[PDB]
Amino acid sequence: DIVAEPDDLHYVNNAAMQQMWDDIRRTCIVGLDMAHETLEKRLGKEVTPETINHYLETLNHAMPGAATHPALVDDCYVKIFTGDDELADEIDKQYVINVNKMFSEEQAAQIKASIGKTTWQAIHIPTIVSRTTDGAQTSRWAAMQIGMSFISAYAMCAGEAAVADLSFAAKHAALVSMGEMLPARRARGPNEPGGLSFGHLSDIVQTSRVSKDPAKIALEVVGAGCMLYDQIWLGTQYATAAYTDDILDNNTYYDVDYINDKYNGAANLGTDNKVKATLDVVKDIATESTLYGIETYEKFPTALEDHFGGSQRATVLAAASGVACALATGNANAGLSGWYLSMYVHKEAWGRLGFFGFDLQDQCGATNVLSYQGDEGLPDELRGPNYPNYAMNVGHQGGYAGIAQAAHSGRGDAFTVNPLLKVCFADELMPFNFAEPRREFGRGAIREFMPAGERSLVIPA
Amino acid sequence: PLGQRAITPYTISGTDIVAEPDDLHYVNNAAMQQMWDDIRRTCIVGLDMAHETLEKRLGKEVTPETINHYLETLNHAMPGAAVVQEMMVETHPALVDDCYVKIFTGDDELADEIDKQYVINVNKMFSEEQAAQIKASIGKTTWQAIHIPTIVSRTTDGAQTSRWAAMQIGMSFISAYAMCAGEAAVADLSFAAKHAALVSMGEMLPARRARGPNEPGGLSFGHLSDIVQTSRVSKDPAKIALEVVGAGCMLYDQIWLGTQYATAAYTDDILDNNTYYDVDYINDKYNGAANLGTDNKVKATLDVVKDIATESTLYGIETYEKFPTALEDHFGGSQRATVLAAASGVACALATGNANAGLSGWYLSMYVHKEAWGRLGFFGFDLQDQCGATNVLSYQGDEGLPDELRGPNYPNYAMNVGHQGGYAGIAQAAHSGRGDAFTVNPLLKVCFADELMPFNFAEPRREFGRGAIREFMPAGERSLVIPA
Amino acid sequence: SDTVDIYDDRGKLLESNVDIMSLAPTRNAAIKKIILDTKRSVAVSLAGIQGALASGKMGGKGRQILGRGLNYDLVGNADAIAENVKNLVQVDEGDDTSVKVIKGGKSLLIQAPSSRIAAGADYMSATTVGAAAVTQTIIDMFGTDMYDAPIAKSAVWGSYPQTMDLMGGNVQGVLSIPQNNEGLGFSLRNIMANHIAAITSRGAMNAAALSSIYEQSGIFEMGGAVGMFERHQLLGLACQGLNANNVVYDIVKENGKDGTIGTVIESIVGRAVEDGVISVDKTAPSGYKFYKANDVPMWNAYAAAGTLAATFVNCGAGRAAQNVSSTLLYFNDILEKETGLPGCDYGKVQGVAVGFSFFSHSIYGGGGPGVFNGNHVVTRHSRGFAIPCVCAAVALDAGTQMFTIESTSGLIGDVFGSIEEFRQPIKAVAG
Amino acid sequence: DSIQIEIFPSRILSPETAQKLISELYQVDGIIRVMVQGPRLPERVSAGPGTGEKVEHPLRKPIQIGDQVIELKISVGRIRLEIENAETKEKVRSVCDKMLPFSFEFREGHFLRRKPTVTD
Amino acid sequence: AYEAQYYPGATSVGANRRKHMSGKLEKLREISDEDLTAVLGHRAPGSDYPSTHPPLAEMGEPACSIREAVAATPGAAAGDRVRYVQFADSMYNAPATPYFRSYFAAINFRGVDPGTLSGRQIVEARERDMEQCAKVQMETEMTDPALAGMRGATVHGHSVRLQEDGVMFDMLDRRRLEGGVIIMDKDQVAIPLDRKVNLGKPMSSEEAAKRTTIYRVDNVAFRDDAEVIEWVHRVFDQRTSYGFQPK
């Protein structure tokens, strides 16, 4: 529709690429309730919604290092969300994210049952801070900020043992980071694309909140995962990976048609109409998906020419098969098995797969899907680019995230792995639009994305 | 013509330009970020191992004209441009202008015929003894200075600086030397360019520390003293050491750790006045020892350190008590021990030639200051300072280290602010007093001896002040790809 | 050849004139048994696995995998899971392997064999063998479909291998993962003060013994005690933690009713001067007596013994745990000002006490002192003479903190309560 | 050109002599900028359990010029000055002697802004 | 036994530091016990001490030899909450300095958690213990009321030049001179009282210098005290030499 050259879509050459990775790398989620339990139990002070509100005006205007540059730092605010409506209404309407308001009723019910009655605060530090050094000081920045905001708002001295107990209860008791630390070689810290699991990226994008068709939600996570994981963590080489020219969309809609034909409506939403995942079901859907996509390539030679390299043919066949199998069974590892069967069927149909290493994740792919060995077994919702198979080479992880979303979107779940991540990014004041990620890179390749973190005000013209 | 504040506007030390303390922070001023970006994006890879693999394993002729072809290919390829014909995506030229590659060799005969637009020569950039020291240090070896985009390191991290390097090195070898674009030679070249012949200033950190590699915890004190090129362009050793003090207190105490008091360790000139006094004192007492020279230095004994450090601190205490000009800030009384300790450390190193002499002077300074005034810094200040005096001349596992190899990942120096910049200045002062060409890493003296850097490593504090008043232009900005 | 005499918690004698060398981590068989049982033991909470399987909360904080609930009773037949896991963990029948069930069937305690420790380069193959054995026992007792095997796996293993740690798996050991070490050989000093107070049932000098045991095991592992430094660290072990010559208990019973830090200082400086350890070398014009050390390792041993005695007196008199961050610091400081000597560990104990106070009064709190282990970046600095004091004070607290000893008691204390070498460490030192 | 001079009294100026000293420094010929900064005098306690308590301070309402009125503001000290003529470099040292009643310390050279920083 | 207890120095300042550590001060002024707890600001004056946890006499202690060996202090046994006292001591010849006030609290008081900064000095204990400690600090010559204000929050003023009436700069007026005598009307955290404390008579400038614990070149030079210089040299040499070889 607004599609442009691949030249101005490379991640350094595209604003929205950078701004959604900046938004993901600057956000942290901090637990708030057991700090209040400390304040109740051994500070002698009764926490009220008025104290909560005053805490929020203290913490939201303290983000630029106040008691940095007021002008530069502006993309900074702390919002709250609770799974307990008893205090969600007395909180000010400018610092609150209602799970009831932003979601449908059953999705909000699942979110509240998952988190219980706890209170959580969503912290976004300035982008300039996350651009200067790595995004591994988001934890420490928000830690010093919420410590200063307890000491300011709730009127304690600095340097007391009860203040120390509150200090540990504030920030390093219940901290939810985007990713965690990294192993030997690529030893980055927290909040990096290596640690950002596939369920996390499924929860970060919010199309599952605002759409009921699981195909669009799955392919949306496929696009966001392809760009983030491949281009940032592993980059490049035909970077526009499976979110242009919509062959993958066509294959996915055909697969949904095939599933709702053969099985009794197994691809629509709802967990009642889900066929149990056996090898026969996976084989059937994965082979039909792959043979359809191969026949589209061999039938339309201009599309075989446009995807010139074998890596993206293999990726768009495997991703379509994987999201298809995940929608049909409700199981994410069924989607992984469909992905790897699509890889093998493509290889035997054409006698050529990819570029030297585009099959590392694939020959030890199908065998590791259902394993329960130590470093070999993991649900696809908990997997990420830190997984041993998926660590180092391009072209794969986007479908891997989209498969997990397709599993937890075919049955109409409220979230893939975290409700904290789902509600945390369910606020429209972000510079990025996580509800529709693949439209924003259309805006970011047409020079219509206006990120923050720029230093134009503090430098000469 | 009237006004009140509660904060003293800091004039940057040695300069007439003045900045209030809440825009000398690494968010407002841009050179604070730009110097660290120049530390990040830079890596150095060595060409000789790659050249001899091209030589024996392909039968290819290595010669100055092929090397000129290879560097022009690489210097085109580095700014994210396509040099091998796969339909890859190119980084936009207007976002990537700060990318170049430059060789320096230990053989001047080889250095002549290589194109001078791609050569940093040891002779034109150093004096005679400096160049002789560096040519004798690096051998007759060929190295090259890699500087990846500022936008690339600004976007992702500093751990991609070695990887973007090795990815755009191998395509350059392939395009300029006609390999297969994928064969068993390219692995040898690109593993030379990534872990065999790669040297990078930032090393890996333990995972308990929640940061990654090529982050200023890994950047050692001798590495940072080798980065700043004040020793190349100036002769007064105290000026060299205090420039390193300013750069270290900026990149170590303000970026690697986030009350922002430690700007004053290179502001308002107290540190200098004390250092110039005690360098005059050493020149008067130890027969001109602290002037430039190798044999005029006194051997680092304990009593020499005691005398120099005690005298420097009593001068600083007398100066403060006589005019407490730099005092009277709301969180006062810290950055009061740092400047005295930095002065004593530079004073001890400039006389002896030993950097651990400077460290022992630093810790003697903290003890004298504490028991003169009955108070020592703010709450968290003397973890390391109360540990350090017994940790400097030790040789245990996690304790023994010269200052020169020390850095912020040292166990005592990991979490406290206001200390690492003085250590970088001490490690520089141990060698600037004897006019050494380098302190630890000779590769980084040459590598940052270049004027195409947007930062000026000749005077870092002058650049901090220059950026503090908005005539500094950085490199990694998204100028074109955003709307107006 | 120093000949330390060691006495117990109540001050009575245990073994006369033991060698200092025989108390080493590398020679004493008892401390070898503590560190081997620390290496191999791992506790699995079946109630947590059952809640993970039914609810879907597996693999981290906040994570919920919806729709894949695997409803099963694990706590009801925990004996059967116990013999099955004993079958899968063990190398051969009748080896050094014992898994036993906790009250109510809510947990079980896997102890890997000694051979799975000898056959692995590091310590925490026990964690992985125990986690895999529990996972396969769950698979064998469901009859689960293999497309629901990963759910039953990550209910036990957490989010590993994506995370470097297990992170939510109910299989949990005492030591951290070897990648989460601070330095070379710090894996054995990653036991916090709450755990090591719960192990010894909140006895003070039966706790300071344990943390000193672990801390000098860490010191001997890192190569920080070789040659003449080995004597120095080992004498510090003997005098501070292990109650040498009743010194650290004599100071307490002498300065209990009305003593302070200063009376402790006067007491141990009198003891050091009377023992011939410290002599006067130049009396100053004001009547000040400057002091010199005849044997510096033994003087640092008295400074360590005095530091533990002073934190006993100050913290127990206050009945509060936050007083180490003052006591170690100002004790060693007034000791230096009293004698003209260096303090304990030549200023390192005083420094790490400043780190304790900065850590646990304003920012990055770490509980109070209960979350203190020597593996932390702010506690690693001293070579083994502050974390005994911290855990000793945590044993002496009266309930001032909220993260009480009972909070992690079912995690670690009841696990290590049946081991007399863990329960009462001083008397179970022989060799 | 315009040299930077700062007057540093040995005691923080109580306002009862800060009327006379600062008013005396307005008969000094050739003045560009007068900078003075002392520690804060807060109307309300902003820290600790006493947060939200109203403080009237004895060191407030410091100045009455007379040609204008300078309103109530925090304590004064370290009076930094900007003067074109260097002939009144020492006459400021002279007129400090007559209307400050005790010893003052001194320093010279770089104290006040010339050309704008990044916040400006 | 080792009855001696001291600090280096033959000057006045060494004598005052030996006095401040030993607590051998001579008491200068009167504040009544209820007025003392009034100005501490933690509770209602002339009340009972609150308890954040029940007494240790009736929950029963764990069986520990140390717990039986050391006295609980009156405050802990009652189970009182921990509260504090703050003091900012001036540079300009104030009778106490933060480290030496901390050693006063260390030698002369039990159950205590002293803390030192440059600008302040936490003393944290149980209420019946911190009460007596703040009593002994406030009555004696250690706390010059003009040179040492009791400031629970915003302790800034220690390095500031004194006011022209010889009084340390008071940010929140937790004491001031009225009628030629020093007057305390707020608590340490600066919430006021209905009552007004006759805090006494401040020392003259030449009198505080005779009994201060700081070293100042215009009062008592640190350079001229070869005893304390030699002490610092002794401990530094021992630290570094025994860090190389601990022999």
Of E152, E162, E190, the CB nearest to D12: E162
Query: Residue C143: left if φ>0, alpha if ψ -120 to 50, beta else—which one?
Result: left
Residue E172: both structure tokens together: 């929140």
Among A39, A43, A151, A157, most E C-beta atoms within 10 A, so best to mutate, is: A157
Query: Residue A395: left if φ>0, alpha if ψ -120 to 50, beta else—which one?
Result: left
- DSSP-assigned letter for residue A245: T
Contact predicate B454/B474, CB 8 Å? yes
Q: How far apart are CA A84 and CA A105, in angstroms?
A: 15
Q: How far apart are CA A418 and CA A110, in angstroms?
A: 11
Contact predicate C393/C315, CB 8 Å? yes
What does each C-alpha distance from E139 to C313, E28, E74, E134 come to in angstroms?
A: 27, 6, 21, 8
A93 in a known ligand binding site: no
Residue keyed to tokens 């792995």: A417
Answer whether E118 sits within 8 Å of B368, measured CB to CB: no
**Which amino acid is it at E26?**
E
Which residues of C are less than 8 Å from B370 in CB distance? none
Q: How far apart are CA B311 and CA A388, in angstroms?
A: 60
Contact predicate A333/A379, CB 8 Å? yes
Which among A451, A444, A13, A17 is positioned nearest to A224, based on CA atoms?
A17
| CA angle A234–A237–A239, rounded 5-degree value | 75
Query: Residue C269: left if φ>0, alpha if ψ -120 to 50, beta else—which one?
Result: alpha
Query: Residue C80: left if φ>0, alpha if ψ -120 to 50, beta else—which one?
Result: alpha
**Which amino acid is it at E45?**
P
Which among B387, B353, B395, B392 is positioned nearest to B367, based on CA atoms?
B387
Pairing of strands E192-200, B18-19: unpaired
Contact predicate A251/A292, CB 8 Å? yes
Contact predicate C44/C170, CB 8 Å? yes
Q: How far is B305 from chain E (nearest CA, A)?
A: 10
DSSP E91-152: TTT-S--HHHHHHHHHHH-SS-EE---SS---EEEEHHHHHHHHHHHHHSTTS-TTTEE--S
- Dmax (CA) of chain E: 63
CB pairs under 8 A between C and E: 204
Which residues of E are less than 8 Å from D20 in CB distance? none
Residues in a beta bridge with C88: none
E39-56 core/surface letters (b: 16 or more CB in 10 A; e: else): bbbbeebeeebeebeeeb
Q: How far apart are CA A277 and CA A260, in angstroms?
A: 15
Q: Which residues contact B246 (CB under 8 A, 6 or more apart)?
A: B13, B265, B266, B421, B460, B461, B464
Q: Report the number of secondary-structure helices (H) and strands (E) in chain C.
A: 16, 8
| CA angle C70–C74–C76, rounded 5-degree value | 130
Of B207, B383, B415, the CB nearest to C351: B383
Among D23, D28, D118, most B C-beta atoms within 10 A, so best to mutate, is: D118
Q: How far apart are CA C149 and CA C130, in angstroms?
A: 17
The total of other beta-carbon atoms located within 10 Å of residue A292's CB is 18
What count of Cα atoms within 13 Å lies in the side-chain half-sphere of residue D13? 29
Find the closest chain E residue to C229 by CA distance.
Answer: E246
Which among A165, A136, A267, A288 is positioned nearest to A214, based on CA atoms?
A267
- The enclosing domain of C130 has a CATH number of 3.30.70.470
Question: Which of the following is catalytic: C7, C288, C330, C364?
Answer: C364
**Could you list the residue range(s) of the whole structural domain that residue C77 is in?**
38-172
Q: DSSP 3-state assignment of B347? A: helix
- Chains C/D: 3 or more C-beta pairs closer than 8 A? no
Query: Residue B418: left if φ>0, alpha if ψ -120 to 50, beta else—which one?
Result: left
Which residues of E are less than 8 Å from B357 in CB distance? none
Preceding amide of B9 cis, omega within 30:
no
| Residues of chain C numbered 190-219 and touching chain A (CB < 8 Å) | none
Residue B422, φ and ψ in degrees, nearest 5? -65, -35
Of E153, E156, E163, the CB nearest to D48: E153
DSSP E194-227: EEEEEEE-PPPHHHHGGG--S-BTTTB-TTT-HH
Which residues of C are less than 8 Å from A164 in CB distance? 322, 360-362, 365-368
**Could you list the residue range(s) of the whole structural domain that residue E106 is in?**
1-247
Contact predicate A75/A427, CB 8 Å? no
**Which amino acid is it at A28?**
C
Q: Which residues contact A89 (CB under 8 A, 6 or more apart)?
A: none
A334-343 core/surface letters (b: 16 or more CB in 10 A; e: else): bbbbbbbbbb
Q: How far apart are CA D119 and CA C35, in angstroms?
A: 59
Answer whether E162 sits within 8 Å of D17, measured CB to CB: no
Answer whether B414 sits within 8 Å of C377, measured CB to CB: yes
Q: How far apart are CA B264 and CA A66, in angstroms?
A: 20
Q: How far apart are CA B330 and CA E119, in angstroms?
A: 10
Query: Residue B182: left if φ>0, alpha if ψ -120 to 50, beta else—which one?
Result: left
Of A69, A155, A458, the CB nearest to D48: A155
Residue B119: both structure tokens together: 């050569």
Find the closest chain E residue to B314 by CA distance.
Answer: E223
Answer whether B387 sits within 8 Å of C351, measured CB to CB: yes
Q: Which residues contact B40 (CB under 8 A, 6 or more apart)?
A: B153, B158, B161, B202, B214
**Which amino acid is it at D58?**
P
Find the closest chain E residue to C294 by CA distance.
Answer: E247
Q: Domains in chain E: how many in total? A: 1
- DSSP-assigned letter for residue D54: B
Q: Which residues contact A330 (CB under 8 A, 6 or more apart)?
A: A271, A274, A277, A407, A410, A411, C67
The total of other beta-carbon atoms located within 10 Å of residue B222's CB is 26
What does each C-alpha distance from A43 to A68, B117, B235, E84 come to in angstroms?
A: 31, 68, 60, 14
What count of Cα atoms within 13 Å lies in the side-chain half-sphere of residue A96? 19
Torsion sign across C-alpha atoms B170, B175, B179, B181: positive
Query: Residue B2: left if φ>0, alpha if ψ -120 to 50, beta else—which one?
Result: beta
Q: How far apart are CA D39 and CA D62, in angstroms?
A: 13
Tell me whether residue C403 is exposed, middle or buried, using C-beta atoms within 10 angstroms of its C-beta: 0 to 12, 13 to 18, 19 or more: middle
Q: How far is E81 from chain B (nearest CA, A)?
A: 24
Residue B393, φ and ψ in degrees, nearest 5? -105, 20
Experimental method: cryo-EM
Which among B113, B352, B82 is positioned nearest to B237, based on CA atoms?
B352
Which residues of C are less than 8 Å from E239 in CB distance? 342, 346-347
DSSP B303-343: HHHHHHHHHHHHHHHHHHHH--TT---TT-SSSSHHHHHHH
Pairing of strands B198-199, C13-19: unpaired
Which residues of C are less than 8 Å from E230 in CB distance? 284, 290
B320 in a known ligand binding site: no
Answer whether D58 sits within 8 Å of E156, measured CB to CB: no
Contact predicate B221/B345, CB 8 Å? no
Q: How far apart are CA C34 and CA C421, in angstroms?
A: 7
Residue A366: both structure tokens together: 């199908």
Answer whether C203 sits within 8 Å of E72, measured CB to CB: no
- DSSP-assigned letter for residue C121: S
Residue E193: both structure tokens together: 């009282």
Contact predicate B362/B341, CB 8 Å? yes
Q: How far apart are CA E92 and CA B321, in angstroms?
A: 9
Q: How far apart are CA E59 and CA A270, in angstroms?
A: 56
Neighbours of E, requiring at least 3 CB pairs below 8 Å, are A, B, C, D
Q: Which residues contact B292 (CB under 8 A, 6 or more apart)?
A: B235, B237, B433, B434, B435
Q: How far apart are CA E106 and CA E168, in angstroms?
A: 25
Of B5, B23, B323, the CB nearest to D117: B23
Contact predicate A315/A396, CB 8 Å? yes
Q: DSSP 3-state assignment of C388? A: helix
Is B380 catalytic? The answer is yes
Distance from CA of residue A349 to its chain's centroid?
Answer: 34
Answer whether E191 sits within 8 Å of D45, measured CB to CB: yes
Q: Which residues of E are annotated as a binding site for coenzyme F430?
A: 118-119, 154-156, 158
Question: Which of the following is catalytic: B70, B118, B252, B261?
Answer: B261
What does each C-alpha distance from B347 to B239, B344, B426, C304 come to in angstroms?
A: 12, 5, 9, 35
Contact predicate A195/A397, CB 8 Å? no
Q: DSSP 3-state assignment of C263? A: helix
Which residues of D are less than 8 Å from E191 in CB distance? 45, 49-50, 53
Residue A188, φ and ψ in degrees, nearest 5? -80, 170
Residues in a beta bridge with A1: none
What count of Cα atoms within 13 Å lies in the side-chain half-sphere of residue C298? 20
Answer whether E189 sits within 8 Å of A159, measured CB to CB: no
End-to-end CA distance of chain A: 35
Which residues of E are less than 8 Å from B367 in CB distance? 232, 235-236
DSSP B144-163: EEEE--HHHHHHS-STTHHH
| CA angle C69–C73–C79, rounded 5-degree value | 140
Is B261 catalytic? The answer is yes
Residue keyed to tokens 């010929």: D29
Which among B248, B307, B234, B238 is positioned nearest to B271, based on CA atoms?
B238
What does each C-alpha distance from A428 to A79, A425, A432, B3, C98 come to in angstroms?
A: 12, 8, 8, 43, 56
The residue length of chain E stands at 247
Which among A278, A270, B100, D39 is positioned nearest to E88, based on CA atoms?
D39
Q: How far apart are CA B136 and CA C29, in angstroms?
A: 55
DSSP C66-103: -S------SSTTHHHHHHHHHHHH-SSTTSS---EEPG
Which among C327, C307, C330 is positioned nearest to C317, based on CA atoms?
C327
End-to-end CA distance of chain D: 23
Contact predicate A80/A119, CB 8 Å? yes
Find the closest chain A residue to B255 by CA distance.
Answer: A133
Q: How far apart are CA C328 and CA C314, in angstroms?
A: 10
Q: How far apart are CA B86 and CA B73, in angstroms?
A: 16
Residue A392, φ and ψ in degrees, nearest 5? -120, -15
- Chains A/E: 3 or more C-beta pairs closer than 8 A? yes
- DSSP-assigned letter for residue A446: T
CB pairs under 8 A between B and E: 109
Answer whether A165 sits within 8 Å of C320, measured CB to CB: no
CB pairs under 8 A between B and D: 81
Among E70, E101, E102, E121, most C C-beta atoms within 10 A, so best to mutate, is: E70
Contact predicate C388/C379, CB 8 Å? no
Q: How far is A162 from chain E (nearest CA, A)?
A: 9
Q: DSSP 3-state assignment of D81? A: strand
Tell me whether residue B288 is exposed, middle or buried, using C-beta atoms within 10 angstroms of its C-beta: 0 to 12, 13 to 18, 19 or more: exposed
| CA angle E9–E12–E18, rounded 5-degree value | 60
What count of Cα atoms within 13 Å lies in the side-chain half-sphere of residue E126? 29
Contact predicate C255/C314, CB 8 Å? no
Q: DSSP 3-state assignment of B419? A: coil
What does each C-alpha distance from B19 to A319, B13, C331, C400 come to in angstroms?
A: 56, 11, 43, 47
Which among C51, C153, C71, C57 is positioned nearest to A110, based on CA atoms?
C57
What does each C-alpha distance from D57 to B282, D43, D74, E147, E174 come to in angstroms?
A: 50, 8, 9, 18, 10
Q: How far apart are CA C413 and CA B290, in angstroms?
A: 61
The residue length of chain D stands at 120
Pairing of strands B10-11, B4-5: unpaired
End-to-end CA distance of chain B: 39
Q: How far apart are CA B83 and CA B175, in angstroms?
A: 6
Pairing of strands E113-114, E123-126: antiparallel
Element (H, E) at C32: helix C29-40
Question: Which of the following is catalytic: B130, B416, B441, B456?
Answer: B416
Q: How far apart are CA C101 and CA C132, in angstroms?
A: 18
Q: How far apart are CA B188 and CA B109, in angstroms?
A: 27
Residue keyed to tokens 């890699």: B146
Q: How far apart are CA C331 and CA C265, in angstroms?
A: 7
DSSP A111-167: HHHHHTT-EEEEEE--HHHHHHS-TTSHHHHHHHHHHHHHHHHTT--SS-HHHHHHH
Q: How far is B128 from chain A (nearest CA, A)?
A: 39
Q: How far is D102 from chain E (nearest CA, A)?
A: 9
| CA angle B222–B226–B227, rounded 5-degree value | 120
- Dmax (CA) of chain C: 89
Which among B106, B98, B91, B180 is positioned nearest to B141, based on CA atoms?
B106
